[PDB]
């Protein structure tokens, strides 16, 4: 019973690895040898946002590249203004332990999650003027890790009980549940088409999930440790992943294998959050040794090093027009780099 | 450009109101001392502090509030979560101390507790935090030894060749046999803690039980040790 299934499962995984090796005609770095290098990219701290009490775990830009939500462990959700360093809102949270925050594409709602395994949506267009809990979603068992808005009606969440759900905000129930992962699902990254997403779990395997169908299409098994953050390439045909083994990796949705690996011998610290740029030439990686390296996505060589934080860079964001790059670390300050 | 100047006045006024509120909360936040309660399922981690028992209830997390000598303490008991704990433990680096509770009655499950303690001690983000240790259910240890069959010497060969430490002070109404067992458990946790030799954090052992009122004062006193060592290290006295 259990031995014929696992033997069939092992012959299927040899077929997949034969496929992946037949398709591997060459590598990306050989092709890209006749490419002009980027050179040294030096960025300076244009702004510092000050006023948090505890460490800043996650943050998310707006679609107008103006207002960013920042989430902290003190129980405060502060909506910032990036140009004038003004706090346009400050929201007191029920649970002090927050692990994610999302900003709506219309700018009407903000969601937050955490160790209280409940996604809380806050309205920002109340006629009274006070922020209030619009609804609470208590379906998951494990902690809530990353949550992102598809629109004002449907939000996608990443729990810690190896399950991703598709929530409806109006009915308050789970539309589609994804139960493919075996390890703790760390973060999810929505596609620009908002039809697919990818989640990296702690089982060293990234999956490609269809929202409307409800099943995974592809499995990527190139890593060696816990996949911390995942981000799509801006065309929707590739993604990048950061893990604890100090290696960023680039994956293809068509070739179904790793294209390139971003590794250096001097740095052995983990990789917290990775965001592409607007063009996709610069890969930005928030490492665990208190600074950010600006990797070249086509040459695998560090342009430059963003050493401005006192503690580990917890999360990294890039505006939709690519104008600035904000990093939040565990010293409670948000540096805006340009 | 006159309308633009008027708009700036609006945002500036809003910022000032929000900023003053964040200062009032800053006073309350600094006065707040966070505590993480970690323990096994069999051991009574809920039974540790019966002094105040406010016991606010959330969905998964449990938070207990208790004040000692006008000093407010928040103790967060993590409840319904998945068994793997290597990712949500990173949140709790900002706490002042981590309360660890173990059950010494079951010797077979004691080994599991030692492994859990070793992982917490050697965790990179838990290096700054001190660990406050409670060796629960001491009364059960007394009654169990009287059976005549020594479980501990089976599970631990080191206890066939071990002497009572002269630094230890036994209670007068206890069997000397039972007192050897109590400190030998205690020494196991201290051997993991001395192996590292960081010097930034320490391990405070205590002999609690099921009916103890003094536990609130103990956690208060060990907090005084943790913040004094912090200042002393900062001025490089220690």
């Amino acid at each position, epitope marked *: 019973e259990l031995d014929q299934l*696992r033997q069939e499962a092992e012959q299927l*995984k040899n077929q997949i690895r034969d496929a992946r090796k037949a398709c591997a005609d060459a590598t990306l770095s050989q092709i890209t040898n006749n490419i002009d290098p980027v050179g040294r990219i030096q960025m300076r701290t244009r702004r510092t946002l000050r006023g948090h009490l505890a460490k800043i775990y996650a943050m998310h830009w707006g679609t107008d590249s103006r207002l960013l939500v920042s989430a902290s462990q003190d129980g405060k959700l502060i909506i910032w203004d990036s140009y004038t360093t003004n706090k346009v809102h400050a929201i007191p949270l029920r649970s002090s332990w927050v692990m994610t925050c999302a900003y709506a594409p219309s700018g009407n709602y903000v969601a937050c999650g955490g160790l209280d395994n409940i996604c809380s949506i806050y309205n920002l267009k109340t006629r009274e003027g006070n922020v209030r809990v619009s609804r609470e979603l208590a379906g998951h068992t494990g902690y809530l890790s990353c949550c992102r808005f598809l629109d004002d009606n449907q939000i996608v969440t990443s729990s810690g009980d*190896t399950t991703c759900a598709l929530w409806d905000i109006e009915t308050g129930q789970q539309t589609t549940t994804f139960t493919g992962h*075996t*390890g703790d699902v760390m973060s999810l990254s929505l596609a620009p088409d908002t039809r697919l997403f990818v989640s990296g779990a*702690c*089982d*060293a395997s990234a999956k490609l999930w269809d929202v409307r169908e409800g099943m995974c299409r592809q499995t990527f*098994t*190139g*890593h*060696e*440790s*816990d996949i911390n953050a995942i981000c799509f390439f801006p065309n929707g045909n590739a993604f990048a992943t950061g893990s*604890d*083994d*100090a290696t960023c990796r680039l994956f293809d949705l068509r070739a179904d294998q790793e294209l390139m690996t971003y590794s250096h011998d001097n740095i*052995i610290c*983990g990789i917290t959050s990775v965001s592409f740029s607007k063009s996709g030439r610069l890969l930005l990686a928030g490492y665990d040794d208190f600074n950010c390296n600006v990797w070249d996505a086509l040459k695998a060589d560090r342009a430059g090093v963003l050493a401005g934080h006192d503690n580990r860079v917890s999360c990294l964001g890039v505006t939709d027009d690519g104008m600035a790059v904000a990093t939040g670390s565990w010293d409670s300050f948000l540096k805006i780099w340009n | 450009t006159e309308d633009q100047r008027n708009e700036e006045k609006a945002q500036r006024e809003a910022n000032k109101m929000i900023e003053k509120q964040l200062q009032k909360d800053k006073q309350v936040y600094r006065a707040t001392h966070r505590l993480l309660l970690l323990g096994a399922d069999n051991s009574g981690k809920s039974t540790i502090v019966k002094q105040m028992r406010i016991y606010h209830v959330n969905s998964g997390i449990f938070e207990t509030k208790f004040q000692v000598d006008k000093v407010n303490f928040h103790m967060f008991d993590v409840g319904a979560q*998945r*068994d*793997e*704990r*290597r990712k949500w433990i990173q949140c709790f680096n900002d706490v002042t101390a981590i309360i660890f509770v173990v059950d010494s009655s079951d010797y077979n499950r004691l*080994q*599991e507790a030692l*492994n859990d303690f070793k*992982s*917490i001690w*050697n*965790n*990179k983000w838990l290096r700054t935090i001190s660990v406050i240790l409670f060796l629960n259910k001491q009364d059960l240890l007394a009654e169990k030894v009287l059976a005549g069959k020594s479980k501990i010497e*089976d*599970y*631990f*060969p*080191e206890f066939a060749r071990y002497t009572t430490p002269e630094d230890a002070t036994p209670e007068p109404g206890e069997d000397p046999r039972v007192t050897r067992a109590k400190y030998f458990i205690r020494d196991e946790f201290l051997r993991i803690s001395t192996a590292s030799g960081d010097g930034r954090h320490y391990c405070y052992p205590h002999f609690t039980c099921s009916v103890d009122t003094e536990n609130a004062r103990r956690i208060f006193n060990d907090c005084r040790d943790i913040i004094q060592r912090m200042h002393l290290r900062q001025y490089e006295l220690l």
Partner: nanobody
Framework: QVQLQESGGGLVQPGGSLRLSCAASGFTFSNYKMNWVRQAPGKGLEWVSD????????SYTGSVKGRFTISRDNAKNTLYLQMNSLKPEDTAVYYC?????????????????????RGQGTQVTVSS
């Protein structure tokens, strides 16, 4: 793909000898601390023993201390466990386990709810 393949075992006798071969494929073997974990029938997982990257620091479980040799070859990419002086009460399934982070000394691998850095295990029965 991280993969662990155990090898050796089967029905044996108490007091005999047995070598457990563990094959680690899909990662760099010298960077990660590795360790042994077993599961008794009708019981939970228990940490057998461990070995560091270089192989200097070696610790054991008390109730089976002095009865098991742990060899960790870096070049061969194999983890050997020597099992002499067996006991009929010490019969279980043996799973190779790997700590999830490189160059570290903390490990969380006693989880029974689908820990995804272990092998399929080998059945080792002792009949008196």
């Amino acid at each position: 793909q991280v993969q662990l393949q155990e090898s050796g075992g089967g029905l044996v006798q108490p007091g005999g000898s047995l070598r457990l071969s563990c094959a680690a494929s899909g990662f760099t073997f010298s960077n990660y601390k590795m360790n042994w974990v077993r599961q008794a029938p009708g019981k939970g997982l228990e940490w057998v023993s461990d070995i560091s990257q270089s192989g200097a620091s070696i610790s054991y479980t008390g109730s089976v201390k002095g009865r098991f040799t742990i060899s960790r070859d870096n070049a061969k990419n194999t983890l050997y466990l020597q099992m002499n002086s067996l006991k009929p009460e010490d019969t279980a399934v043996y799973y190779c386990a790997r700590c999830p982070a490189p160059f570290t000394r903390d490990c969380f691998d006693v989880t029974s709810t689908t820990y995804a850095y272990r092998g399929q295990g080998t059945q080792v029965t002792v009949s008196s």
